[PDB]
Enzyme design. Structure first.
Site, PDB file in Angstrom:
ATOM      1  N   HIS A 146     -10.073   0.602 -13.241  1.00 34.94           N
ATOM      2  CA  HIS A 146      -8.752   0.856 -12.709  1.00 34.94           C
ATOM      3  C   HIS A 146      -7.808   1.378 -13.827  1.00 34.94           C
ATOM      4  CE1 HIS A 146     -10.301  -1.616  -9.468  1.00 34.94           C
ATOM      5  NE2 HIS A 146      -9.149  -1.705  -8.841  1.00 34.94           N
ATOM      6  N   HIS A 162      -3.904   7.356 -17.049  1.00 34.65           N
ATOM      7  CA  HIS A 162      -2.767   7.505 -17.973  1.00 34.65           C
ATOM      8  C   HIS A 162      -3.139   7.317 -19.458  1.00 34.65           C
ATOM      9  CE1 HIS A 162       0.383   6.537 -14.690  1.00 34.65           C
ATOM     10  NE2 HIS A 162      -0.808   6.480 -14.122  1.00 34.65           N
ATOM     11  N   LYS A 208      -1.539  16.662  -8.321  1.00 33.94           N
ATOM     12  CA  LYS A 208      -1.303  15.195  -8.106  1.00 33.94           C
ATOM     13  C   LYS A 208      -0.028  14.706  -8.802  1.00 33.94           C
ATOM     14  CE  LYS A 208      -4.357  13.613 -11.886  1.00 33.94           C
ATOM     15  NZ  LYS A 208      -3.065  13.400 -12.667  1.00 33.94           N
TER      16      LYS A 208
END
Length: 273
Positions: A146, A162, A208
């Site tokens: 994740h 990120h 995105k």
């Protein structure tokens, strides 16, 4: 809601204590080029990065070995292989000898959110971060995937993503198309040397949302911040208002019970002090 005093302070210290570094100029060079969308990026964001410093000597090595593992994958998602385990172990091992992580540790001990011993802390961290969990049953994903890999699923729809080291890796592999930076109208320009940017990139030509990224920071840095924020609350999401250096931030983490979910910074402002 309001600025989290104790955490902007603890984090600022971790920032100061980020021995493992990587520094803008000699260690990496980024090319901002242009704005994402509004009134043109073409080159990769990361014009250079000291591969040897990544290529072991540093905790980036163990980090990169975990990133690469999910690249290859060879394997179903519910399977934890002896290999992925030793790699999980090597990473924990490496970050735990770090002063950032010893610092992070000390904080959470003081709150009795972690136990004094190195090994229990290592186990605690393993479960939060590397224990497989599921959305049904069927544990097919973990916290590191994740947060750092950039997507839960194996298998991909589609980030998530990120971490600057993963951006760099996936950008080299040509899966990341850097589209430019995101500022605000009023409030002026970002700089090649900023350690937090708002960046936009396509994933395999999928357009995105913009997201923020720490830049140059060690992976034991983010790991620490995310762990501490994860332990600081019993609800589904925290958005902890921080002020690291000049940047005003939000430290977001999603929680799934005793396991951590997507985690990232959100950039609120740059020239503040």
């Amino acid at each position: 809601g309001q600025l989290n005093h104790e955490l902007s302070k603890l984090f600022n210290e971790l920032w100061d204590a980020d021995q493992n570094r990587m520094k803008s100029g000699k260690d990496y060079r980024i090319s901002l080029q242009g704005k994402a969308g509004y009134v043109s990026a073409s080159f990769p964001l990361f014009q250079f990065v000291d591969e040897e410093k990544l290529k072991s000597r540093k905790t980036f090595a163990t980090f990169i070995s975990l990133l690469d593992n999910y690249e290859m994958d060879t394997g179903v998602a519910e399977v934890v292989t002896p290999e992925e385990i030793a790699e999980n172990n090597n990473f924990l091992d490496a970050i735990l000898e770090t002063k950032v992580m010893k610092m992070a540790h000390d904080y959470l001990v003081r709150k009795n959110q972690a136990k004094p011993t190195r090994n229990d802390f290592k186990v605690q961290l393993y479960n939060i971060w590397f224990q497989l969990y599921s959305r049904g049953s069927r544990p097919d994903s973990c916290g590191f995937e994740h947060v750092f890999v950039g997507e839960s699923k194996r298998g991909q729809e589609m980030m998530g993503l990120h971490n600057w080291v993963q951006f760099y890796l996936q950008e080299k592999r040509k899966n990341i198309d850097y589209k430019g930076y995101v500022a605000r109208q009023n409030k002026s320009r970002p700089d090649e040397d900023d350690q937090v940017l708002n960046l936009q990139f396509n994933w395999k030509e999928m357009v995105k949302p913009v997201g923020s990224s720490f830049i140059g920071v060690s992976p034991e840095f983010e790991f620490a911040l995310y762990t501490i924020v994860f332990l600081a609350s019993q609800e589904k999401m925290s958005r902890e208002v921080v002020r690291l250096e000049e940047y005003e931030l939000q430290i977001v983490v999603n929680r799934h019970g005793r396991y951590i979910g997507t985690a990232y910074p959100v950039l609120l402002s740059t020239n503040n002090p």
